[PDB]
Amino acid sequence: STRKAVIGYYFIPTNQINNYTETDTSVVPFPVSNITPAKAKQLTHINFSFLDINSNLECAWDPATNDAKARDVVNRLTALKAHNPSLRIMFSIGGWYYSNDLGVSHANYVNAVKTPAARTKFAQSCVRIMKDYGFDGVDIDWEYPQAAEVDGFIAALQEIRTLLNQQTIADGRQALPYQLTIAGAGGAFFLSRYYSKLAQIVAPLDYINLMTYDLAGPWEKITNHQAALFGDAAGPTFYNALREANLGWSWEELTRAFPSPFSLTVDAAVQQHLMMEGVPSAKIVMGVPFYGRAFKGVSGGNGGQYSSHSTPGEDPYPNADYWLVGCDECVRDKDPRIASYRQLEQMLQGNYGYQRLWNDKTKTPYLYHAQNGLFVTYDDAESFKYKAKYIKQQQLGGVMFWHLGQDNRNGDLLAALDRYFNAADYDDSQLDMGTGLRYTGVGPGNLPIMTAPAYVPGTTYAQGALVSYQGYVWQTKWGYITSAPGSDSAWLKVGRLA
Ligand SMILES: C#CCO[C@@H]1[C@@H](C)[C@H](OC(=O)NCCCNC(=N)NC(=O)NC)[C@@H](C)C(=O)O[C@H](CC)[C@@](C)(O)[C@H](O)[C@@H](C)[C@@H](O)[C@H](C)C[C@@]1(C)O
Ligand SMILES: [Cl-]
């Protein structure tokens, strides 16, 4: 009976705000009016993006922004709520450009959360901006706080939470309370920056929206799927950085939670969150891309998958060779490395030389261009069936996506997600989830239900013996043990009872 969240980013850059129009897609390709009533109903959240933190260490619009045009654009979004009383228009602070380790505003994020007075000033600025512009909540997309900054970041979420809760009371908004989310890492390497303190990060949130995409890109040696649901044994594997996090666990605890190497998948990230105690499945939201990542210079044989490649990683894109055949948006944006789903439909439909292929382990599509040596990893309405089924099975909070302007005109990706969660006549009970590699880590937060004979005092237990005691199932790490389970370092808690 609890509706899955469906959280869609709406991005619009300052120049497009300042020149805003709904009737000239060469100035504003994706005006608010493209979000029809039918789409408004299919969404639960729209994250307006991006705001920033300025050098006064406050939430702020880009200072080049025209305030009147900004208010007008935001009002058009909040008008959508007339079609859907569940809808929230969040705003989002950060993004890669502002907040990455070398981003233009990076130090402001670091400083804004550093001290108690700075957090007070920052937190207040967030809720003031929310109220002043009519937003329904605050999303933080800082990519990413490093381990040293993480206590500040946590305290800043806690302080924003408290102020949001005051505001909910003031405005009598218990029916649609003001919400706090973050865009959280969706792969272990960035996740490791705050993993040890995950429960504290998630506690003040309504959701943590996992960025379980961009798991592959020009920075890797080898082409791969950017958002594989499950692992492909033929694909690359990675060092599990989480095993080096400051957790204080034992060798066995670490080994049983963090297999390494591992397959960098959506399912990995979700399980890595669930493993942690105090991180509930209902607060975890699976991110999906509405775009593809394109690679050139690939070799044939396996559809361009798991190939070396010659895709430039530099920013800005280093020349005017827009080699992604058929991609008109790429020419407009001067970058061939990203293509919207909208665009990819057109590329596949025209005579551009792509095949659409399907990897039945990862449960994701990909384009291959055999003649030129191109590979594109993306998501579509089919991959979303498996991802939606997984969402339901794991009792996650919902789905998030970047971004709305990349759906096709009819909004088929959004419609498909809404249908897989909510359509009375949609049935995925027979949908086969395949034999891709699952992430098998177990931690304190996701012990399976087990049974075993009750521990008996005086009994000598060999290595691997399983007993039950005080609510859990326990396993000896070596033999022979007679100590009560949990009373020393010889027992591993492996399961929970009854
Ligand atoms: C959050 C994300 C992605 O940001 C956008 C870039 C970084 C864009 O990055 C991507 O779209 N990545 C895929 C999504 C990855 N998502 C996230 N990291 N986070 C997320 O999804 N959060 C919810 C890159 C390629 C770019 O053009 O960069 C060019 C230069 C190469 C750049 C930085 O000049 C941009 O042109 C920017 C000037 C401008 O377009 C906006 C501000 C950035 C944007 C929206 O295009
Ligand atoms: Cl709610």
15 CA distance to ligand 2 middle (Å): 34
Q: Whose CA is nearest to atom 44 of ligand 1?
A: 97
Quick check: CB of 30 below 6 Å from ligand 1?
no
CATH number of 290-379: 3.10.50.10
Rounded to 5°, the CA angle 165-167-171 comes to: 120
In Å, what resolution does this model reach?
2.3
Other Cβ atoms closer than 10 A to 101: 9
**Known catalytic membership, residue 345:** no
Domain spanning 448-498: CATH superfamily: Carbohydrate-binding module superfamily 5/12 (2.10.10.20)
Tell which residue, 109, 171, 112, has the closest CA to residue 136.
171
Domain 1-289+380-447 has CATH 1.10.10.10: no
Quick check: CB of 338 below 6 Å from ligand 1?
yes
- Helix 150-170 with 116-133: angle, nearest 10 deg: 40
- Residue to probe by mutation, ligand 1, list 7, 17, 61, 96, most atoms within 8 Å of CB: 96
184 CA distance to ligand 2 middle (Å): 20
Joined together, the tokens standing for residue 30 give: 């994706």
135 CA distance to ligand 1 middle (Å): 23
Strands 354-359 and 338-340: unpaired
Other Cβ atoms closer than 10 A to 201: 21
**Cβ(95)–Cβ(49) under 8 Å?**
yes
Tell me the CA distances in angstroms from 216 to 190, 318, 385, 434, one per residue in order. Answer: 13, 20, 21, 22
Tell which residue, 337, 326, 410, 418, has the closest CA to residue 377.
337
Quick check: CB of 216 below 6 Å from ligand 1?
no
Separation CA 438–CA 410 (nearest Å): 34
Separation CA 87–CA 367 (nearest Å): 34
Quick check: CB of 318 below 6 Å from ligand 1?
no
Strands 398-402 and 338-340: unpaired
Q: 383 φ, ψ to 5°? A: -55, -30
Q: 401 φ, ψ to 5°? A: -150, 145
- Give domain limits for the chain: 1-289+380-447, 290-379, 448-498
Quick check: CB of 300 below 6 Å from ligand 1?
no
Q: Whose CA is nearest to atom 34 of ligand 1?
A: 316
